Design a protein around this ligand. Structure first.
Ligand SMILES: CCCCCCCC/C=C/CCCCCCCC(=O)OC[C@H](COP(=O)(O)OCCN)OC(=O)CCCCCCCCCCCCCCC
Ligand code: BEF
Ligand SMILES: [K+]
Ligand SMILES: [K+]
Ligand SMILES: [Mg+2]
Lengths: 190, 29, 674, 557
């Protein structure tokens, strides 16, 4: 019985309840309790936004900690066209990319080991990955120390300050927040 | 499109129709 | 299976290779299509229209043709002569005749013409022996029609003009003397035509196990069809593709042919077991149907009771010297030949000493049944003995003058209420008493019907005889129900009622009024003493001619259900494993890497597919020797039986494919055929 | 790193059973038409106002009610998407979708597929997302839970004709189950970092000279309901790896739980409604053995990884090519299996960059019918089709009559079960065959070799099984692909729902008989093994040639 009255009433009532009331209630409660996470978790340096604390940018300097590749549509680390390169394992273009990335990393960091970490050489799933494990971000303390004139002790304590272990060891990885790490690396040297 | 592939598709569809009709009328068949 | 049956099955197989008759078998029809495609590909290759090897596709066509031909042959034997035939009824209808009678009165000629030339209003003439041509209403004369095809009771009934007993039927043989019939139905719809149409025109259903296995077959066939058909686009993507002959051969190699052949393996093995237990079965489904029956319809006259109503007791009148009654009955019914007269003679002669008087050389004169006085007997020197029914003797005695007694009235009443057919003996006058003629149950039947009630089979007892008798016999025999006075259409409607509820019915009859019903029942056991019409309509003759042969039939049926189950496990496992053993050989052409998936190291795709067709053929042929052997018929729980089947059969079925195909391929490569 | 894999799987399943056992009691109160504790006057006023005064429904009326609700939702969502340049809440003045893309999106969301051939950041406009896609998440999830309510009622009702009211089932399910749970999950996610706001896109100026434009939709509510009702329709392009949808590892764990929550609860509830708990624990055992074996295989395959990495200069060969550094490779493996088994479709990693076996296992889990903790409501009645099939086959190999939960099964149900089991594989094979035979269909593949065919197969497999996930290298935004996948989704979904309602209508009118010699118990290791065998053998006997020319060809290469 697709009776027109109970069918149209059920659908309209569920429409309002699950389309307006539920979104609105979640928005009001979020904006009341967690207004910084719900508005983007943006970083403010006065009147200018330096980016979310979750999105991660394309650092290319020589005194900055670099993240993974992106492979987003228009430019690297583009929040408007997220999506990673879907090159298979058997695609030779993936090897073509990885060889060049390893060569560039060995050329930029001639003072560390010659076994590049896997994180830095392969793209992320969203192309907006702000995170690299402590070891992958400690592989490049020589370069950043020479560039900044810091010591390895200051830089390793800095990386330690921005690491974030998960609750239990086996549901995630310990990771570094690169955007804030580099903002603090700037604020350190005035 | 061709002759071989079209004939094969026709034959496969006829066989599938025949099998589903024989599955609905399982008593006769 | 004597020789003639095998040649008949071979011819029915070749005849059933027609596509219009193969269409009713999905798996074998697909094998038929594949065989046709492969023979056509082989011709197109031999002629030069296509490139390739024509003798490998010819060998595959030839083996698919052998698979189809043997499948049709095995199905011929198992279910070739399972239908209800009306050959005897038709023979009576066609070889009939009768004599048209100009000048409707008796004093005229007799133009012998076929029975189809008659029509409504004609005036036919029949005399002793002839078979009444068609329906009608006697107008002149009276006789004794032998209406045992309609009712069942083989006692002649008097048909005469004027009164109520004037309607005759076509097919019942007249016995006493002449009568002038006037037809009453156009040649279209007589009674014989009605029941010839009831016999042929009644279909037997398929059991539930058959339908379940058929649905499983069709599901597996759709699965394999989709897989092997869509194989071509997927393989043609990566450069080279899969050949066409390889495709059709793979299709007709993968599908479940063993499961298709299982129904005939169980059919033949069931018929063999039945014959071993002294029942001649003509249908293989009948045995499994007996395996799970729920009702048992039973005839009375012919089936349960001997069927000729022998003599039981003498009952004299007041001071009439019972010895005199017995002597009179003996000397009177002497010349008679019907079982009732000889039975009276035997009863009197073994209940008293009267050997001296029996002789056929003496001068006495025997008065046979005249149908005008309705009493037979004998006339000896200054003697006149007459045996007859109550009312005929009443008329005779009243006509002479002698006042009819009153004791006989109540006496015959009592005998009738007992469930017998009373007679009367008279030595000119002073009726000498009654001689009940009750019909005797065959033998140790109460026990067997108790066993049938314990097994969980209801026991109706249909009849074509009056209620008094059906009630008395149903009491003595020990059946549940009964339906007295049931014409053939009544029996057939009862069967259709009972088997419309879903349950199966197992009628056991012998006469010609049972042929409709026997033609519609699932297990139709016809007594070996029954008429040819009964024996042809049924689907298993009972050479012991005992109603309670069903207690052994249902045993062999339960055992054939156990066998059908274990063989079903074997078949399913054999098919699922042959898929894995065959299909890895359809990838060697597309990607060389997939050679790693060829676990049995078969030679090549061509050899693998030829091995598969050979193995399919050999397995269907060997399935029958598997059914014949049987299994251990122990009573096991559902789970224990399932686990045992899985272990022995399901795993033997798993290993037979791989080893069988490998050895066949080894023989091919060793012999050089590749 | 095998101790970590074992601990991850163990903790997942343990917390899942703990959370789902209490909810199963609630769902059992709903299947028995009993009102929940405190909602019995609210329910009266609401039903009187909506005009749904209780009056039962046979199977025809129930089926027609469900289909009518779904078609009304389809029409509404289609027209809404076409005309989104007239509706409010459009900060970036996006234009209305096409006819082919709007049709595919409507059909996908209405049938619980949530197949995405677009980019949500630059296509939809805060009102298609809010008042369209998530309304259909709630409605499709409740339609699926209601069909299974009707089927359990058919199994437990003795000699009746009516399966209860459908409108009351939808309202109870939605209001009392899907909205509160979703609200709590949404508030958690927002606490962890997800978005909830209606602001215009934010203009960032990077630490260096670059520029960025961050999208700022109301992400958390749709995240919560998408996971909870196994819809799996992301707000952004990267489905559930975007830092605004899966902020941390705790949210990822809670999403993995949410997906498998109601499936498992429905299994506990099915066990409780028959009065025999063994009946339900049997389903949980069969489903869990397959899920654990698949997870272990995928984890091993990924941890082995790309062999060329360790030769080009890298330090380890683990496959970290399509995975976020926020979750490990073990977590991404577990989630790949979880989503493909659960018919959810939310992807935490790029399945196209997985290795050959890694990618093969989720695909096969999709292709066997999604009867391993399958979709919300869909998984359980799919598994019940397979249970009826296994009971039939066992009856066949013992020679006795089939019988499940007392009621005797006849051949009309066997015909319906066969058709229902054979509809999805025909759509998969036929659609993939048509896709591979037309230039338009096979010009979408991104990768060469057998991996292109693997992409095409995975896409039509996902659409035909209402899964949703994809390899995402397939450039499947064209009229051909949109129309093909729309047809596959629609037919799969409803051509499976219809035979289930027919079977329920045929079983509700029987009466549970007594034990016999043809009654084999449907618990214990024997029937679990028989049921696993049935499922895996049907799947293999259909998809082995298709998987030998894709994943296995590439793996063995
Ligand atoms: C190589 C190529 C591979 C192709 C595979 C095809 C194989 C087909 C048949 C062969 C099976 C061989 C089985 C041999 C195993 C022996 C069985 C046994 O002994 O059961 C052992 C225990 C009992 O526990 P219990 O304490 O004793 O009982 C306490 C009661 N609750 O559990 C068990 O594992 C039972 C396991 C039974 C599994 C059966 C799976 C087959 C299902 C058939 C499905 C086919 C349908 C076609 C699809 C459309
Ligand atoms: F032969 Be029965 F009496 F019909
Ligand atoms: K989904
Ligand atoms: K998706
Ligand atoms: Mg008889």
């Amino acid at each position: 019985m697709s009776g027109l009255r109970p069918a149209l009433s059920t659908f309209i009532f569920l429409l309002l309840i699950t389309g307006g009331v539920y979104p609105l209630l979640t928005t009001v409660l979020g904006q009341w309790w967690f207004p910084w996470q719900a508005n983007g978790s943006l970083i403010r340096e006065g009147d200018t936004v330096r980016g979310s604390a979750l999105i991660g940018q394309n650092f290319t300097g020589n005194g900055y900690f670099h993240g993974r590749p992106s492979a987003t549509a228009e430019m690297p680390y583009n929040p408007q066209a997220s999506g990673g390169s879907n090159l298979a394992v058997s695609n030779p273009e993936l090897d073509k990319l990885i060889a060049a990335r390893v060569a560039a990393l060995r050329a930029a960091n001639p003072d560390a080991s010659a076994s590049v970490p896997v994180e830095l050489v392969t793209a992320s799933a969203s192309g907006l990955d702000n995170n690299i494990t402590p070891q992958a971000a400690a592989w490049q303390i020589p370069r950043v120390a020479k560039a900044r004139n810091l010591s390895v002790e200051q830089l390793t304590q800095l990386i330690a300050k921005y690491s974030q272990q998960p609750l239990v060891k086996y549901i995630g990885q310990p990771v570094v927040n690169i955007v804030e790490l580099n903002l603090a690396l700037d604020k350190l040297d005035e | 499109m061709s002759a071989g592939v079209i004939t094969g598709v026709l034959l496969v569809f006829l066989l599938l129709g025949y099998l589903v009709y024989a599955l609905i009328n399982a008593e006769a068949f | 299976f004597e020789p003639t049956l095998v040649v008949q099955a071979l011819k029915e197989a070749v005849k059933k290779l027609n596509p219009q008759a193969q269409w009713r078998n999905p798996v074998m029809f697909i094998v038929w299509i594949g065989s046709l495609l492969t023979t056509c590909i082989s011709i197109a290759m031999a002629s030069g229209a296509m490139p390739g090897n024509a003798l490998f596709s010819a060998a595959i066509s030839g083996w698919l043709w052998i698979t189809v031909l043997f499948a049709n042959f095995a199905e011929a034997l198992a279910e070739g002569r399972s239908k209800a035939q009306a050959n005897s009824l038709k023979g009576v209808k066609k070889t009939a005749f009768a004599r048209k009678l100009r000048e409707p009165k008796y004093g005229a000629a007799a133009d012998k013409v076929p029975a189809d030339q008659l029509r409504k209003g004609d005036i036919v003439l029949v005399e002793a022996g002839d078979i009444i041509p068609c329906d009608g209403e006697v107008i002149e004369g009276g006789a004794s029609v032998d209406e045992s095809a309609i009712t069942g009771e083989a006692a002649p009934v008097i048909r005469e003009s004027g009164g109520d007993f004037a309607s005759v039927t076509g097919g019942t043989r007249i016995l006493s003397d002449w009568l002038v019939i006037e037809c009453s139905v156009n040649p279209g719809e007589t009674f014989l035509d009605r029941m010839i149409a009831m016999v042929e025109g009644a279909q037997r259903r398929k059991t539930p196990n058959e339908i379940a296995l058929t649905i499983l077959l069709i599901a597996l066939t759709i699965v394999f069809l989709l897989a092997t058909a869509t194989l071509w686009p997927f393989s043609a993507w990566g450069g080279n593709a899969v050949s066409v002959t390889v495709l059709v051969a793979l299709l007709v190699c993968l599908i479940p042919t063993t499961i298709g052949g299982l129904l005939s393996a169980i059919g033949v093995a069931g018929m063999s077991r039945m014959l071993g237990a002294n029942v001649i079965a003509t249908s293989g489904r009948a045995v499994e149907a007996a395996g799970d029956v729920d009702v048992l319809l039973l005839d009375k006259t012919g089936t349960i009771t001997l069927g000729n109503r022998q003599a039981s007791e003498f009952i004299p009148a007041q001071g009439v010297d019972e010895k005199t009654l017995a002597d009179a009955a003996q000397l009177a019914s002497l010349a008679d030949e019907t079982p009732e007269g000889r039975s009276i003679v035997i009863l009197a002669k073994q209940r008293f000493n009267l050997r001296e008087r029996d002789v056929q050389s003496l001068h006495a004169t025997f008065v046979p049944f005249t149908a005008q006085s309705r009493m037979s007997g004998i006339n000896i020197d200054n003697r006149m003995i007459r045996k007859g029914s109550v009312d005929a003797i009443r008329r005779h005695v009243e006509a002479n003058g002698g006042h009819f007694p009153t004791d006989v009235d109540q006496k015959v009443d009592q005998v009738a209420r007992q469930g017998a057919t009373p007679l009367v003996v008279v030595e000119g006058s002073r009726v000498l008493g009654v001689i009940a003629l009750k019909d005797i149950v065959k033998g140790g039947i109460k026990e067997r019907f108790a066993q049938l009630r314990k097994m969980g089979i209801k026991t109706v007892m249909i009849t074509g005889d009056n209620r008094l008798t059906a009630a008395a016999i149903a009491a003595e025999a020990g059946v549940d129900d009964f339906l007295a006075e049931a014409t053939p259409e009544a029996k057939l409607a009862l069967i259709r009622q009972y088997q419309a509820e879903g349950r199966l019915v197992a009628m056991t009859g012998d006469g010609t009024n049972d042929a409709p019903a026997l033609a519609q029942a699932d297990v139709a056991v016809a007594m070996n003493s029954g008429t040819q019409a009964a024996k042809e309509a049924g689907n298993m003759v009972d050479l012991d001619s005992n109603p309670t042969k069903l207690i052994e039939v249902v045993h062999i049926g339960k055992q054939m259900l156990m066998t059908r189950g274990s063989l079903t496990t074997f078949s399913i496992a054999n098919d699922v494993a042959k898929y894995f053993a065959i299909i890895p050989a359809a990838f060697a052409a597309t990607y060389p890497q997939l050679n790693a998936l060829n676990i049995m190291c078969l030679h090549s795709p061509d050899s693998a597919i030829l091995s598969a067709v050979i193995f399919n053929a050999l397995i269907i042929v060997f399935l029958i020797p598997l059914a014949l052997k049987g299994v251990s018929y122990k009573p096991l729980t559902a789970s224990a039986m399932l686990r045992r089947n899985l272990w022995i059969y399901g795993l033997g079925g798993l290993l037979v494919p791989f080893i069988g195909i490998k050895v066949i391929d080894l023989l091919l490569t060793v012999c050089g055929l590749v | 790193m095998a101790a970590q894999g074992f601990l991850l799987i163990a903790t997942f399943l343990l917390v899942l059973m703990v959370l789902a056992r209490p909810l199963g009691s609630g769902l059992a109160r709903l299947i028995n038409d009993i009102p929940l504790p405190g909602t019995t006057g609210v329910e009266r006023v609401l039903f009187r106002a909506l005009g749904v005064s209780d009056r039962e429904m046979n199977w025809k009326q129930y089926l027609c009610a469900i289909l009518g609700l779904n078609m009304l939702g389809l029409a509404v969502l289609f027209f809404m998407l076409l005309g989104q340049h007239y509706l409010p809440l459009n900060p970036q003045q996006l234009p209305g979708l096409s006819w082919d893309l709007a049709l595919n999106t409507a059909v996908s969301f209405v049938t619980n597929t949530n197949w995405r051939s677009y980019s949500g950041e630059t296509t939809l406009s805060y009102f298609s997302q809010m008042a369209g896609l998530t309304v259909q998440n709630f409605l499709s999830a409740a339609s699926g839970i209601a069909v299974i309510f009707a089927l359990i009622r058919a199994f437990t009702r003795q000699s009746m004709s009516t399966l209860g009211n459908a409108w009351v089932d939808l309202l109870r399910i939605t209001l009392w189950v899907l909205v509160p749970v979703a609200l709590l999950i949404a508030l958690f996610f927002i606490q962890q970092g997800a978005l909830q706001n209606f602001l215009p896109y934010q203009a960032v100026n990077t630490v260096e000279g670059a520029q960025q434009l961050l999208p700022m939709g109301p992400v958390a509510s749709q995240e919560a309901i998408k996971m909870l009702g196994t819809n799996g329709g992301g707000f952004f392009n990267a489905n559930s790896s975007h830092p605004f949808e899966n902020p941390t590892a705790l949210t990822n764990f809670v999403q993995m739980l949410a997906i498998f929550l109601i499936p498992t609860a429905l299994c506990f509830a099915f066990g409780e409604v028959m009065g025999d708990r063994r009946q339900g624990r049997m389903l949980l055992w069969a489903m869990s053995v397959i899920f654990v074996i698949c997870v272990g295989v995928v984890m091993w395959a990924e941890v082995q990884g790309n062999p060329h990495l360790l030769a080009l200069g890298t330090d380890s060969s683990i496959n970290m090519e399509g995975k976020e550094s926020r979750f490990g490779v073990l977590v991404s493996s577990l989630f790949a299996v979880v989503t493909t088994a659960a018919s959810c479709g939310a992807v935490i990693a790029m399945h196209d960059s997985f290795t050959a076996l890694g990618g093969m296992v989720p695909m096969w889990l999709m292709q066997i019918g999604e009867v391993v903790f399958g979709g919300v409501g869909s998984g359980l009645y799919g598994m019940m089709l397979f249970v009826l099939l296994a009971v039939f086959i066992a009856g066949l190999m013992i020679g006795r009559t089939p019988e499940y939960l007392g009621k005797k099964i006849d051949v009309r149900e066997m015909k319906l079960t066969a058709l229902a089991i054979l509809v999805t594989p025909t759509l998969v094979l036929m659609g993939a065959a048509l896709a591979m035979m037309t230039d338009a269909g096979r010009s979408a593949m991104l990768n060469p070799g057998p991996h292109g065919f693997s992409e095409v197969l995975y896409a039509v497999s996902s659409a035909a099984n209402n899964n949703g996930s994809a390899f995402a290298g397939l450039s499947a935004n064209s009229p051909f692909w949109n129309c093909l996948l729309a047809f596959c989704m629609f037919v799969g979904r409803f051509g499976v729902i219809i035979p289930v309602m027919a079977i329920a209508g045929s079983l509700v009118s029987k009466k549970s008989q007594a034990a016999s010699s043809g009654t084999l118990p449907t618990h214990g290791p024997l029937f679990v093994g028989l049921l696993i065998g049935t499922v895996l053998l049907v799947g293999a006997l259909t998809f082995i040639p298709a998987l030998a020319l894709g994943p296995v060809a590439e793996y063995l290469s």
